[PDB]
Amino acid sequence: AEPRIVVLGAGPAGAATAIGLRRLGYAVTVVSEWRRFAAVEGVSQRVLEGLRHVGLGGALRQAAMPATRQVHWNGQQLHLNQEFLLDRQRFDRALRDDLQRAGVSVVEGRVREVVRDVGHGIRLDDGQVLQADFLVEARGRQAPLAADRLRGPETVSLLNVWQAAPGAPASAVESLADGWAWMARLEDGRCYWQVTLDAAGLPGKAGLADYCAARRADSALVTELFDARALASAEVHARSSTAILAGECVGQDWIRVGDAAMAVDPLSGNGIFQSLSSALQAPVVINTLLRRPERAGLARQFHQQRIEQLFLRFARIGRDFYGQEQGRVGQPFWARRQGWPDMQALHVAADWSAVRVERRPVLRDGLVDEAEVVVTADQPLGVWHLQGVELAPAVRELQAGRPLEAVVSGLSGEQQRMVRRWLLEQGLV
Ligand SMILES: Cc1cc2nc3c(=O)[nH]c(=O)nc-3n(C[C@H](O)[C@H](O)[C@H](O)COP(=O)(O)OP(=O)(O)OC[C@H]3O[C@@H](n4cnc5c(N)ncnc54)[C@H](O)[C@@H]3O)c2cc1C
């Protein structure tokens, strides 16, 4: 009498969630399409061990290759390295091995339609119908269009892909007047160029090839890095790269993870990590939805609020990157992106007067429960405990006028010093 869990999509987020469910003891089936266009992304040192932290590190090193990287930004020609390139062709095909290794069924196929048929009726292009008691939606930006909770400045990434001479790997980033470009050349000679711009005023389909060709032809970086440019014959692709927080991300028997839940624009070079963050606690939410469905409200709130806070944090991190470009002051592309989503600092200022004790969702023993937590400026979702020491009783007593020394007198001296340091950081000084 075990639930049928089906995950749609086998990118980083779907794969991560599937393996997490396996570790909780769940049988899991993943459905996803074999491949898509040739895309290579920039990945940091963190992402790759973060990707093995989740258990996808096998899918990793034959898809990732080291490469130098010229960075042009704020008037500085800067030659960084120790960041890699990830070939999503190798990567996604390799993700399926790690899933089968973990005991996950990988049913290849494009999903046609999902229907409310007792459970979930997942109808595939080849006519097969897979029944799901629980559905994980993990098809990335290709997820079915729902309403948005938040939407940033409309943004498009235009991509050129072509073939050049092998054996000369490199990558680069340059700030342009009305956008920025990322480009890469793999060791086998595959070439990549992707420019990120405001969606407004771009040409239609027929004009995109000429538009990209002129931009590549205008770049001294493109000339240096690429001997053959294939200005006329390069494939041309257009990707929506708008920052999007999904309107709905969890139900009684479904959950969205990854880009299907939230995605910010790709300036950070950290999207895969950010998508993994959105799936990190998806398995415990599912575990609650299945083992204690009476607590679905709490579990749903836990996932929604985590996803929204992640989205906002990554959006502000990206904003600060845009803000490092200080030589573009009259340009609408940059001004719009240097002030979005807002001007709030990444670490908010304390306000002890505003601290509240509230009953909020918490994680305990693999299930979303509810507990009195302490809500602060820096933690809108609340802090439950520090190393087992629940804070709400202390803060209740402090707000009732009990002196701090008495409030903490029952803990060990080390726990007393731990609690005092937290209170200082929350503005009780
Ligand atoms: C222009 C651009 C540039 C980026 N650059 C970077 C970068 O340099 N570094 C970085 O770390 N991140 C980058 N990202 C972000 C990164 O691609 C995503 O964060 C990440 O891939 C999202 O993971 P996911 O598993 O949620 O979705 P995906 O990785 O997109 O996985 C979705 C999976 O589902 C499949 N699928 C889609 N539709 C269907 C369907 N109907 N039926 C079945 N399967 C389906 C797809 O084939 C795919 O395997 C970039 C994103 C964009 C848009």
Residue numbers in the entry: 2 to 430
Excerpt from the paper describing this PDB structure:
Cysteine tryptophylquinone (CTQ) is a protein-derived quinone cofactor initially identified in quinohemoprotein amine dehydrogenase (QHNDH), a bacterial enzyme that catalyzes oxidative deamination of various aliphatic primary amines for use as energy, carbon, and nitrogen sources. Here, we shed light on the qhpG gene, which has been predicted to encode a flavoprotein monooxygenase, directly involved in CTQ biogenesis. Biochemical evidence reported herein proves that QhpG is an atypical single-component monooxygenase, catalyzing dihydroxylation of an unmodified Trp residue in the protein substrate.
In the crystal, each asymmetric unit contained two monomers that are related by a non-crystallographic (NCS) two-fold axis and packed compactly. Thus, the dimerization is assumed to be a crystallographic artifact. Each monomer consists of a large N-terminal catalytic domain (residues 1–344) and a small C-terminal winged-helix (WH) domain (residues 349–429), with a large pocket between the two domains. Briefly, the isoalloxazine ring of FAD is sandwiched by the side chains of Pro267 and Glu42/Arg240 from the re- and si-faces, respectively. The side chains of Glu42 and Arg240 are apart by ~4.5 Å from each other, suggesting a weak electrostatic interaction, and are located over the middle of the isoalloxazine ring. It is possible that Glu42 and Arg240 act as a lid for the si-face channel, through which dissolved dioxygen is able to access to the isoalloxazine ring.
